[PDB]
A paper describes a structure:
Here we present the isolation of a broadly neutralizing antibody, CT149, from convalescent patients infected with A(H1N1)pdm09. CT149 Fab fragments were prepared and co-crystallized with H3-HA (A/Hong Kong/1/1968) and H7-HA (A/Anhui/1/2013). Crystal structures of CT149/H3 and CT149/H7 complexes revealed that CT149 indeed recognized residues in the stem region of HA. The heavy chain of CT149 binds into a shallow groove in the fusion subdomain of a single HA protomer, whereas the light chain binds to two regions in separate protomers, one consisting of residues in and near the extended loop of HA2 located in the same HA protomer engaged by the heavy chain and the other consisting of HA1 residues in the fusion domain of the neighbouring HA protomer.
In both structures, each HA trimer was decorated by three CT149 Fab molecules. While phylogenetically both H3 and H7 HAs belong to group 2 HAs33, and the epitope residues contacted by the CT149 heavy chain were quite similar between these two subtypes, the epitope residues contacted by the light chain of CT149 were moderately different. The heavy-chain paratopes in the CT149/H3 and CT149/H7 complexes were remarkably similar, whereas the light-chain paratope responsible for HA binding was larger in the H7 complex than in the H3 complex. The HCDR3 loop was observed to cross-helix A, at an angle of ∼90 degrees, enabling residues V101, V105 and V107 to create hydrophobic interactions with residues in the groove. In addition, the HCDR2 loop was found to contact the N terminus of helix A, enabling residue Y54 to make hydrophobic contacts with residue 38 (L in H3, Y in H7) located at the bottom of helix A. The residues contacted by the light chain are not conserved between CT149/H3 and CT149/H7 complexes, as a consequence of the divergence between these HA subtypes. In the CT149/H7 complex, the LCDR1 and LCDR3 loops contact residues from helix A of HA2 on the fusion subdomain (N53 and E57) and also residues from HA1 (K25, R32, G33, K310, Q311 and R312) of the neighbouring protomer, contributing to the majority of interaction between the light chain and HA. The LCDR2 and FR3 loops contact residues from HA1 (K54, G55, E278 and N291) and a residue from helix A of HA2 on the fusion subdomain (N60). Of note, CT149 neutralized two representative subtype H7N9 viruses, A/Anhui/1/2013 (AH1) and A/Shanghai/2/2013 (SH2), which have caused hundreds of severe and fatal human infections since March 2013 in China. A single treatment of 30 mg kg−1 CT149 in mice provided 70% protection against lethal challenge from H7N9 virus.
Numbering used by the authors:
A (entry chain L), B (entry chain L), C (entry chain L): 1 to 110
D (entry chain B), E (entry chain B), F (entry chain B): 323 to 491
G (entry chain A): 1 to 107
H (entry chain H), I (entry chain H), J (entry chain H): 1 to 127
K (entry chain A): 269 to 316
Amino acid sequence: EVVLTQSPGTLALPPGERATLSCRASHRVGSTYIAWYQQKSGQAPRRLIYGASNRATDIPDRFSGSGSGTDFTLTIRRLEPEDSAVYYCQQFSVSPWTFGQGTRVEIKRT
Amino acid sequence: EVVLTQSPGTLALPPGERATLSCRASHRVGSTYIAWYQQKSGQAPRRLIYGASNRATDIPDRFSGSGSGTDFTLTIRRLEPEDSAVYYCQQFSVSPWTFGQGTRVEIKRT
Amino acid sequence: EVVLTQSPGTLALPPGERATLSCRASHRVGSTYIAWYQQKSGQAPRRLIYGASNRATDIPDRFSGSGSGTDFTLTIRRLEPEDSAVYYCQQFSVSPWTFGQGTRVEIKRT
Amino acid sequence: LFGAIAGFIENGWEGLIDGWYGFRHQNAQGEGTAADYKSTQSAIDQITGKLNRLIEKTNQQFELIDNEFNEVEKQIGNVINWTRDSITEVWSYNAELLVAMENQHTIDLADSEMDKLYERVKRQLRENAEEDGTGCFEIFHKCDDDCMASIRNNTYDHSKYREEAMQNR
Amino acid sequence: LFGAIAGFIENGWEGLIDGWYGFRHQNAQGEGTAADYKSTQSAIDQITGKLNRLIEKTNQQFELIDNEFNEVEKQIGNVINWTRDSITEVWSYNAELLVAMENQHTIDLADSEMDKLYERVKRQLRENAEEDGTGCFEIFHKCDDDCMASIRNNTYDHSKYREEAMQNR
Amino acid sequence: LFGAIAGFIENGWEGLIDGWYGFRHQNAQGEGTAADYKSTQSAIDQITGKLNRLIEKTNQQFELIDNEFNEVEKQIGNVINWTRDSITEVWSYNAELLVAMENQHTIDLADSEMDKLYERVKRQLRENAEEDGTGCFEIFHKCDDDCMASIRNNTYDHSKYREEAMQNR
Amino acid sequence: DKICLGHHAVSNGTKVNTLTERGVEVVNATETVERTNIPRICSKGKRTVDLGQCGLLGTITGPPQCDQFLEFSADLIIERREGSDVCYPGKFVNEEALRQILRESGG
Amino acid sequence: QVQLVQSGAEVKKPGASVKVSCKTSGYSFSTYGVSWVRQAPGQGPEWVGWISAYTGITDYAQKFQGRVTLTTDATTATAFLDLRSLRPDDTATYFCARDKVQGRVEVGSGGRHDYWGQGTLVIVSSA
Amino acid sequence: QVQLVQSGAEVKKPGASVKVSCKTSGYSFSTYGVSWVRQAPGQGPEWVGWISAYTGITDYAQKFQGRVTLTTDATTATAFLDLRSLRPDDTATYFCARDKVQGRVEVGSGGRHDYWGQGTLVIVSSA
Amino acid sequence: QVQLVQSGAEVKKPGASVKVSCKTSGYSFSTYGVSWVRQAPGQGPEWVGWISAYTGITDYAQKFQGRVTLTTDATTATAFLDLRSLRPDDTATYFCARDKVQGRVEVGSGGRHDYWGQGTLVIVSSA
Amino acid sequence: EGDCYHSGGTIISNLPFQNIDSRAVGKCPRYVKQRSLLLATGMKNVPE
Ligand SMILES: *[C@@H]1O[C@H](CO)[C@@H](O)[C@H](O)[C@H]1NC(C)=O
Ligand SMILES: *[C@@H]1O[C@H](CO)[C@@H](O)[C@H](O)[C@H]1NC(C)=O
Ligand SMILES: *[C@@H]1O[C@H](CO)[C@@H](O)[C@H](O)[C@H]1NC(C)=O
Ligand SMILES: *[C@@H]1O[C@H](CO)[C@@H](O)[C@H](O)[C@H]1NC(C)=O
């Protein structure tokens, strides 16, 4: 199957800074068959990006995905407080449709 | 359908000068499916060029066609008195086989 | 059919020098369908090269074939006494599978 | 072509807005028309497969190498122009050949799917029906609406109507 | 291939100079051979379509960028030579792949047309004939020259010979 | 596709290690399975033909035109980089399209060969058998092992079992 | 009692080209060549520097038009036709080499 | 010597049916087939329809579909153009032209409208 | 307004059979079909299976092949997820998501897992 | 160890029929098939024909079509070359060579005339 | 936003080919000569 491995496991950055999340596939996947998701503790995962770079409806333009082949990237241009969550990448080019293990994003300052 | 629009409507030039007649298609036609015709008042149209640049049998080498895509040109390198006529371009790539509205060529000097 | 014509008819060179044998086809043959053979007086022809440049099993690395299209070459980098023989090129891309007329290699010094 | 979508089947059904392929039966209960979902989806999948493979862009970034404002030196300028034009020709060739080749296969595979469904029904009826010649099957045991539906979802038992049909030839 | 032009039909007819496809019938009146004009023309149209699409030239003009008389400087010369060779490789690849691909389709579509005409006749005879296995149809109602001609121009009424033929199996 | 390798024939035989295509018969003497050598070899030939055409290298030699140690001047460097990247894109496009196109044809021609062998047997049995619908032929004259083998090597005389079979319908 | 089968059709189809024919009418087709351009330089998500009346080389020497750019930063650098590398009349040796360096400099 | 000779001029009442002929000499028949073009007085040329003398396949323009019928030699290598329900708009000069290679594959457009007839005026009026 | 509303949470004994529902509103049914994803507590998401509401064709992952069955509306446009022989590993949150255009050709992945359900916790234990 | 061992030398009268054998050891049979090459005294090599031991399909050169017949093992993995109507021109050394992979797809020409036999002289004369 | 620019603006497109400007830079569709190339997304239309 296709293995999606995300990095880093955990990303901690102050609010208003730029976050870069990686998803690296084992096999070459076409850009159309890749999606990014956000999930907070307890709720259903909301779709952020589809097709590797297309923003989903009502998604803020600070979430932008890029990349091709085996390397895909979700960029949070300027972090907001409500961006603290877990982020999963997904492939559905060939079944089984697989997910990345995720990347947690945390903020800062006491 | 494919619209062939010719320009100019009327071309008036002294004998021995160079005449340039345009035929512009709405859609991309392959060079092979384009012909030019000469017609004088009362007679049948004689074929001058076929395939956009090939001269027909016994046609003087002062009639040369060129161009590709949507822009095609019939050039009369040096006009003679008997070149005073109407000139039509034709397409027969896809049916209906359409004609241009024509270009009239007139000479000069009293 | 495909005509393989070899040159020269006869090649005479001292031992330890470099021999170059040509095989020129009438038609373009793919490199895979070409072989070179060695034959001495009385015995069966042993295969030297197959596929225009691949050495056969237990063949010394002083026999190297090259070329493509219509021009193919068997090179004996440094001649040894036991290299004195006849050399044939063969094509088996399209039937009839044809042979070159051959090239004889002779050595030197009294 | 293949095995005739625009051949023995003389025309398509503009009234068939339920799918891409389907059946139109006639019996003692009236007129009937229903789409085939699986064969339609087979075709749709393949075309979608093409499109998503074709619609795509590079992740290769190309920069500026000449100048629109203050022109570069002629010799390097002419090399650049010559090279760029050459690539244009190659991509123009590739593009038009690609589209032409794909369109040939798209039409032919749609032909393929229609032929596959057709000859499937043919094997489904065994000796209980005969080939009309226009894509139809003349049935020899007066098939009712439930019988027709069994043919549509590939469950029709040929040997339960065999006696009556072979008698009527 | 497709459905066998060089398969169950063992060979072609060198005597058939009237068309690309045709019929050769045998009855009580002698030997007969006639071409099929429409299926031949179908094939001819498609191949003509290819050729006229393939035979073509650019309207793009390319100029001189190096010099045969007084050689350009080495560094720009080597870049130019390297680029030109690269384009040559691409066009050499394109050309040989193009021709190879086209030839594969030309042969296969000719196969297609023969299969289409063949299985058309098969549906045209219904149950009045049986498949020989070599492209022939053994008829079970001794068809005369007018009967054969009705088969050629697709007018043969199967149900006017059906009784006699089904009796003779 | 074509005419269904992964269609009416539901699956392949992992036990068939003797060839690529074959027969599996059932009668009063037990279970039997044997490969078909000629149709297998037809497929193998075509694929081998592709591979040997595809696996190939240039005899064109390309040299160095920039420098890994002491970098060339920026302007000629950027032209070179721009050109090389462009060729890379073209070959990347060509490569992926080539492989994709070839794989489509390889699968389809294997389909073709299976269909060709299948419908050959169909014509080989004439009216002595009937189409099962899953790639099988229900025989109506209880064929023994010698009878089966005659079907395998294309020698089966249909008219020597015709009477018995047509009686049993 | 018979059962027929067939395919869907539309009264108004789209014409496309194939290997073997031209202008064959298919049920529906899509465009593969983009002609629609946005007559603006889209800059969302990029630090954009419109040099305006400053010549890109001017950011090195620093003539008056380039005072606001002496230490600029950009993902996207834009040159304008009114630009000028110079206040006191003069020019750069190998000017196009330097422009290409500064173009891919980030600032 | 290839030549296309059409029938004489004609005068018809509106709603009637006209029939123009086109005699063929020079080439072989059923090797090309014929295109028909008509020209209204003071206007340009417009294509009407094409028929193969080899296959018999016809292709008309939408304007004439249903009231035009093209046919070819009984055996004497001659093509016919049959128009009916003649409007006053159908007043034009009707040209036949030899067109498009048939029972043979050939590159190019050398046999496309290569030879024309002298013409045939069809006046559709009641007066 | 497209919304996916799943059934309530469930508690099952090991070796039993569970059945989660997914009610559809907003779109049309049989124009997409449904993907199912499950999430073990404290773990990531994992795809379970997909079913077309248009064709009925199902595609499962190898892990669940043989004990999972996906079905769709009796007529009320609702999808079901049937798991049986419930291990303690099957303890997870089961999400349904509307997925993949059906009776129509469309470019892109806009209709791929575009709308999800709120979820359904399935606790498989004996206590 | 793959080896091709042919039968002994032969002397035939003109118009007769000769039969050269080729015993196979080392490989498996019907995995390659055999090419036959003949060499006239003082002349070069010329290809005669090829037979598959897997399919039985034969391919001859035009010169020998109709009087050459290639066959393969009764079951003992051995190939035969049958020539008849022997001219004096047929005087040559007849080599058999293992040739071309059969029941398997393989890239390259490694199995093309890779192993030869020692040869078999066929003298066709009356004296 | 877009990643393909020219002097006249921005090419925002998923399409593989562009016929706007051969000197477009960034990450662009391939420039082609053709103004249009229609890719079929349906079967052969055969109206009644
Ligand atoms: C190269 O082509 C461009 C147009 O694409 C043109 O403006 C320029 O002048 C050409 N180069 C030279 C050296 O003329
Ligand atoms: C480039 O190739 C040409 C032949 O095509 C050759 O004459 C020339 O010398 C080569 N360039 C250089 C710098 O040698
Ligand atoms: C061209 O690309 C190479 C890597 O392939 C890089 O090292 C070099 O710096 C590039 N050229 C310039 C002028 O930067
Ligand atoms: C035609 O196909 C396109 C695919 O790009 C699709 O978006 C469009 O809706 C289709 N048109 C119709 C009328 O179905």
